Amino acid sequence: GSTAEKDKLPATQKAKEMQNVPYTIAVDGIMAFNQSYLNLPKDSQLSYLDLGNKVKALLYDERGVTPEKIRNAKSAVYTITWKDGSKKEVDLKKDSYTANLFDSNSIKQIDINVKTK
């Protein structure tokens, strides 16, 4: 029966797990979402230089674009929405001074938009 025993169920790890934050991407004016999620540190802050290591991975894993082409794009902006419900957009195509760390634990989702043509 279904009420047999719940203890029979599996277990989990206590060492150190990761979180799954849903991200988005805009291409050709149309967004491409496939329920894909991104990995992040638990209760740990991170920067763009480091976090990018995981992001860039999806960039090529999605369509196979390079960091040299995505930069030459007509436009490049990154959107980050915190658990608070607030979202901010950062214009990478015009950002050479911006720089600040963030807490993944306080992150909800992100929406990347790169206009290339």
UniProtKB/TrEMBL annotation:
<keyword id="KW-0732">Signal</keyword>
<keyword id="KW-0677">Repeat</keyword>
<dbReference type="InterPro" id="IPR005298">
    <property type="entry name" value="MAP_dom"/>
</dbReference>
<dbReference type="Pfam" id="PF03642">
    <property type="entry name" value="MAP"/>
</dbReference>
<protein>
    <submittedName>
        <fullName>Cell surface like-protein Map-w</fullName>
    </submittedName>
</protein>
